[PDB]
Amino acid sequence: FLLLLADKVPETSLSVPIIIRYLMFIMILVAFSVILSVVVLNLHHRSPNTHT
Amino acid sequence: RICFNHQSSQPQTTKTCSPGESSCYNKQWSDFRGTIIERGCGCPTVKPGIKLSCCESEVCNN
Amino acid sequence: DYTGKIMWTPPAIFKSYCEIIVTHFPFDQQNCTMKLGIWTYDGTKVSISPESDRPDLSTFMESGEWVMKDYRGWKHWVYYTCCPDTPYLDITYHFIMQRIPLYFVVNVI
Ligand SMILES: *[C@@H]1O[C@H](CO)[C@@H](O[C@@H]2O[C@H](CO)[C@@H](O[C@@H]3O[C@H](CO[C@H]4O[C@H](CO[C@H]5O[C@H](CO)[C@@H](O)[C@H](O)[C@@H]5O[C@H]5O[C@H](CO)[C@@H](O)[C@H](O)[C@@H]5O)[C@@H](O)[C@H](O[C@H]5O[C@H](CO)[C@@H](O)[C@H](O)[C@@H]5O)[C@@H]4O)[C@@H](O)[C@H](O[C@H]4O[C@H](CO)[C@@H](O)[C@H](O)[C@@H]4O[C@H]4O[C@H](CO)[C@@H](O)[C@H](O)[C@@H]4O)[C@@H]3O)[C@H](O)[C@H]2NC(C)=O)[C@H](O)[C@H]1NC(C)=O
Secondary structure: OHHHHOOOOOOOOOOOOHHHHHHHHHHHHHHHHHHHHHHHHHHHOOOOOOOO | OEEEOOEOOOOOOEEEOOOOOOOOEEEEEEOOOOEEEEEEOOOOOOOOOOEEEEOOOOOOOO | OOOOOOOOOOOOOOOOOOOOOOOOOOOOEEEEEEEEOOOOOOOOOOOOOOOOOOOOOOOOOOOOOEEEEEEEEEEEEEOOOOOOOOOEEEEEEEEEEEEOOOHHHHHOO
């Protein structure tokens, strides 16, 4: 979707358009979902031979 | 410390270099209209088309 | 005016060849010039002289991608080995331009 929008957004540096702010919000949210899923899987695959 | 600072075929004129400078240079190159000679103080870096000379005497860059 | 003094102020779109150092992009500063001179006459027939030490930016439209840091104009006298007492004149205006690195930090970095 970022690629899709790369050719339609003004190339000025006095502010960031609300649509790009929304896309970065969603992107960072997906990234944190990835991080916390890794954490959940790490907790799930623990055992007494490795962790107390 | 004293160099020539005139250009091309202009009447001769000299300058006193800064304290600690010992050299004098002579750049020559040709543009679309003719040949230019640049005389001054020091020894600079020149692009690979210029005839650069440097001398550590006095008034020896003519 | 009745004394013969002429003031002519025509518009122009200038497309100048400006070297672009890209070592520090998108945090780069550029030094772009505009060399002007009389084409067929030498400084003994047609002399030129700058009106002020630096360009007029009183009605300058702000850019959005660039910030004007400094600007100056310099006049040069050039003599050739062939012709000992004929100078060739030119005024060169330079503009030191700093880029605004927000679009590229939010979109690439
Ligand atoms: C961004 O990019 C820009 C473009 O690249 C870049 O611009 C450059 O900026 C620098 C400044 O930082 C500019 O350098 C200055 O240029 C001035 C103009 O130079 C030309 O004119 C000189 C004067 O010519 C007259 O006088 C001669 C005798 O003095 C005569 O022989 C001439 O015939 C002529 O006489 C006419 O005028 C007289 C008075 O007006 C009059 O009496 C007479 O009758 C007649 O009408 C020339 O000497 C000079 O030529 C030299 O340089 C060229 C190469 O450029 C050589 O090939 C020549 O052989 C020759 O050496 C130019 O044609 C200079 O005046 C100015 O010099 C002063 O400052 C320097 C500092 O280094 C001193 O070394 C120098 O002695 C001068 O000192 C005096 O003034 C300073 C303050 O200014 C002070 O110390 C003290 O008062 C001192 O007495 C200087 O060099 C440069 O030209 C720009 N380049 C351009 C525009 O292309 C810009 O910096 C960049 N920005 C960045 C990177 O930040």
